[PDB]
């Protein structure tokens, strides 16, 4: 029985985690109290992936909530699904990081990491066969980035042969909420690129574009963005929990997607997405899902795939559908858009099919791309980083916590190296000498 431990750190991580536990607790019929009131018999078959069993026929998730400020925890407890979580997993302190990466990594988070690791070790030792971990956090913040990277490092030290996913919300060009986003993002990417098997790229501008242009929401709020995120996180791991014609574990996705160890930054997407009144005007078929998946406006990372080349892509379909349609559609997408796919991989489309769709839909699909265009993201941060590092704009707040100026140089060099491989595979031939 494959089982995954969920960790959520910081405000963004906690909010996305709460919404995620409501989407996964409505597909596996779970009452907010924790009882089961579902209808289908397949809901309980694989409940142990996310939930532990409690004595009164109750189910408690494996979530572990971390934060250096208590207030967010209260907002989780005083909520629709606040009582579902175990009280002992609310590990927190006081005097938050204050959007300082150094405080999250070195000064404050170092005191609470021992308690968090105690809880994580207790949760993992009871698992029959641990598949891996998940972490939801934000790179542009304080406790989120620093504590997440520290926990990732410690866990990979203790559990080297287990998958470590990561759903990170990174900075964006125009929608920026902190003035020191570049430093935090750079020092976080310096850690993620080394100690993570899969990283998913999310940014708020792409989600806002989806809300405004596809869903046509007039006044989107953070709930809708977390809704889309939760949809994709549920889509990624659908095959561990349900049967299908062609399964795809997390490890299968990792093996097929990453060609080399350091290229594990992915662009996620979900289909279908319609705006209420338009629902009756669009027929739901596999070609429609394939068309919407590969559209550049549907991506969640604000990186246009047309500026690069797809190293790999993966498509996880949910619903009763014909395998011939899936195969022909993926082959047609590869053949028509031959310029946007790398040439030294003969076939770079993983396909998986699961039988049971979401609750209120007949068919659905999740898309995980790995393309060179992601380099642009890092490059942007690097530019801003140097624009602040040449003058040491806010550097004393970091060096006052026991840091040194060399670490910034290490992080910048590592990000620049990472951009190199992408830029390389990005061209569309190499003949001349």
């Amino acid at each position: 029985m494959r089982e995954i431990v969920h960790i959520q750190a910081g405000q963004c991580g906690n909010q996305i985690g709460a919404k995620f536990w409501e989407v996964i607790s409505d597909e596996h019929g779970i009452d907010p109290t924790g009882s089961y009131h579902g209808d289908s018999d397949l809901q309980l078959e694989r409940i142990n992936v996310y939930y532990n069993e409690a004595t009164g026929n109750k189910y408690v998730p494996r979530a572990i909530l971390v934060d250096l400020e208590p207030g967010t925890m209260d907002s989780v407890r005083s909520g629709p699904f606040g009582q579902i979580f175990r009280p002992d997993n609310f590990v927190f302190g006081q005097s938050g990081a204050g959007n300082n990466w150094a405080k999250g990594h070195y000064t404050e988070g170092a005191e609470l990491v021992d308690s968090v690791l105690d809880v994580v070790r207790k949760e993992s030792e009871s698992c029959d066969c641990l598949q891996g971990f998940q972490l939801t956090h934000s790179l542009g913040g304080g406790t989120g980035s620093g504590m997440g990277t520290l926990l990732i490092s410690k866990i990979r030290e203790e559990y080297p042969d287990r998958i470590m996913n990561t759903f990170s919300v990174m900075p964006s060009p125009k929608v920026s909420d902190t003035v020191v986003e570049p430093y935090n993002a750079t020092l976080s990417v310096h850690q993620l690129v080394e100690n993570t098997d899969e990283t998913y790229c999310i940014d708020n501008e792409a989600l806002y574009d989806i809300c405004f242009r596809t869903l046509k929401l007039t006044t989107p709020t953070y709930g809708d963005l977390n809704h889309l995120v939760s949809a994709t996180m549920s889509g990624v791991t659908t095959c561990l929990r349900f049967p299908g014609q062609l399964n795809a574990d997390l490890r299968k996705l990792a093996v097929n997607m990453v060609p080399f160890p350091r290229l594990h930054f992915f662009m996620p997407g979900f289909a279908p997405l319609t705006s209420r009144g338009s629902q009756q005007y669009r027929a739901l078929t596999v070609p429609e899902l394939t068309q919407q998946m590969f559209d550049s406006k549907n991506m969640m990372a604000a990186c246009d795939p047309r500026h690069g080349r797809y190293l790999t892509v993966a498509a996880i379909f949910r619903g009763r559908m014909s395998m011939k349609e899936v195969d022909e559609q993926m082959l047609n997408v590869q053949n028509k858009n031959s310029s946007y796919f790398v040439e030294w991989i003969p076939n770079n489309v993983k396909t998986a099919v699961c039988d049971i769709p979401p609750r209120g839909l007949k068919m659905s699909a999740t898309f995980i791309g790995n393309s060179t265009a992601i380099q642009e993201l890092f490059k942007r941060i690097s530019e801003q980083f140097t624009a602040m590092f040449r003058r040491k704009a806010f550097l004393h707040w970091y060096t006052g916590e026991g840091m040194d100026e060399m670490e910034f140089t290490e992080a910048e060099s590592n990000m620049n190296d990472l951009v190199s491989e992408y830029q390389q595979y990005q061209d569309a031939t190499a003949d001349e000498q």
């Binding site: 080297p160 080399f260 160890p261 000498q433």
Partner: protein, 88 residues
């Protein structure tokens, strides 16, 4: 034992890749004198090649010596060694 073997094999494969990449551009320039940008030699896919970055690359010299036992029982050893020496 399995962990040690896997890590050793990964490091050896990365070292083979970096050595092969280094020799090719070498020959290339030495004859093409062109400067095909600086290509990209994967130094960071392992600590071993990372620490030896200054020695492997740049103006340097390199030579790998391989020993091949002589029995008829160690055939499965010897051939494999040649296959690793066939690189570079």
């Amino acid at each position: 034992r399995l962990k040690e073997g896997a890590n050793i094999n990964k490091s050896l494969t990365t070292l083979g890749k970096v050595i092969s990449a280094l020799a090719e551009m070498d020959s290339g320039p030495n004859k093409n004198k062109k400067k095909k940008k600086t290509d990209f030699i994967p130094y960071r896919d392992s600590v071993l090649t990372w620490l030896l970055r200054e020695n492997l690359g740049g103006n340097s010299r390199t030579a790998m010596v391989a020993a091949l036992s002589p029995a008829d029982i160690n055939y499965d050893e010897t051939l494999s060694t040649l296959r690793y020496a066939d690189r570079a």
